[PDB]
Amino acid sequence: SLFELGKMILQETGKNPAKSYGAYGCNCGVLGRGKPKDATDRCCYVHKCCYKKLTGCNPKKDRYSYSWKDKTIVCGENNPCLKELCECDKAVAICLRENLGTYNKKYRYHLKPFCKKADKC
Amino acid sequence: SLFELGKMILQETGKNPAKSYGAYGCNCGVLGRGKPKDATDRCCYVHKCCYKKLTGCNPKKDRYSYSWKDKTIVCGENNPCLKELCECDKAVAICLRENLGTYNKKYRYHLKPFCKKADKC
Numbered sequence: 001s002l003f004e005l006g007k008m009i010l011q012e013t014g015k016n017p018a019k020s021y022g023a024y025g026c027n028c029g030v031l032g033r034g035k036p037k038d039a040t041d042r043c044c045y046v047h048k049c050c051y052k053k054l055t056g057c058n059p060k061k062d063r064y065s066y067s068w069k070d071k072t073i074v075c076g077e078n079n080p081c082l083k084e085l086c087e088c089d090k091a092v093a094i095c096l097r098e099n100l101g102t103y104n105k106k107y108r109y110h111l112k113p114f115c116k117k118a119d120k121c
Numbered sequence: 122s123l124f125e126l127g128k129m130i131l132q133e134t135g136k137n138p139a140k141s142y143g144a145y146g147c148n149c150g151v152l153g154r155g156k157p158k159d160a161t162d163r164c165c166y167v168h169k170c171c172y173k174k175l176t177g178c179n180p181k182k183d184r185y186s187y188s189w190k191d192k193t194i195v196c197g198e199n200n201p202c203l204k205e206l207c208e209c210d211k212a213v214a215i216c217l218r219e220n221l222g223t224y225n226k227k228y229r230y231h232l233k234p235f236c237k238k239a240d241k242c
């Protein structure tokens with residue numbers, strides 16, 4: 001759920017997730033997708049497309065277990081849907097950290113309604 | 122200072138530092154040293170002996186800079202004493218994470234005044 005997602009982002013990046021990524025660009029955080037602005041935003045585009053394959057579970061509210069083991073995110077067993085959910089979230093947290101070099105503060109609080117429409121996943 | 126030390130322990134172990142290590146065994150956290158109970162406690166014994174070499178700065182209150190860069194603690198330049206300080210702190214955080222497998226909850230709130238005296242550093 002959002003609680004696990006946010007924790008993973010903090011562990012990987014060292015940054016407060018709500019603040020750095022809760023409204024970044026056209027795809028990170030609240031709302032749906034749009035044309036990416038940069039590589040951090042493209043990480044969040046892939047992540048939202050990752051959620052589209054999740055069958056019956058709720059990406060926003062279902063909790064799942066994972067542990068931070070030798071500084072790596074390891075998705076616990078859980079059920080089929082929660083496992084894929086955890087795997088979506090781990091991959092966006094790693095991608096956000098990988099692209100910290102190009103993170104741009106000007107997109108931090110982006111006006112999402114003016115984004116160009118996104119391509120189909 | 123304590124703020125950097127706690128943050129490093131959280132980043133490496135994923136655990137709330139105050140709660141897990143603020144009074145652990147005979148050497149972690151408050152107070153001085155004593156005979157170690159286990160490997161977590163020996164990490165904190167080494168750490169406090171690391172602090173004894175620093176007489177030109179204050180391990181508890183002086184701030185210093187460091188960054189979490191690709192999930193590794195990197196001590197910033199700072200001055201001679203703060204650099205060594207950062208280096209003591211980085212090594213205890215890594216040691217505490219390495220010995221998480223044997224962490225024992227029975228020593229979490231240890232009665233330190235009954236510890237056997239420690240060997241000289």
Ligand SMILES: CCCCCCCCCCCCC(=O)O
Nearest residue numbers: 002003006007017018021028029
């Ligand atoms: C410790 C953090 C508590 C939960 C905060 C959750 C905030 C999630 C931020 C989502 C942005 C990333 C993106 O959309 O993938």
Ligand SMILES: CCCCCCCCCCCCC(=O)O
Nearest residue numbers: 123124127128138139142149150
């Ligand atoms: C985010 C944490 C805020 C600062 C909390 C500092 C607690 C430091 C705990 C010391 C225990 C480790 C030992 O003695 O090395």
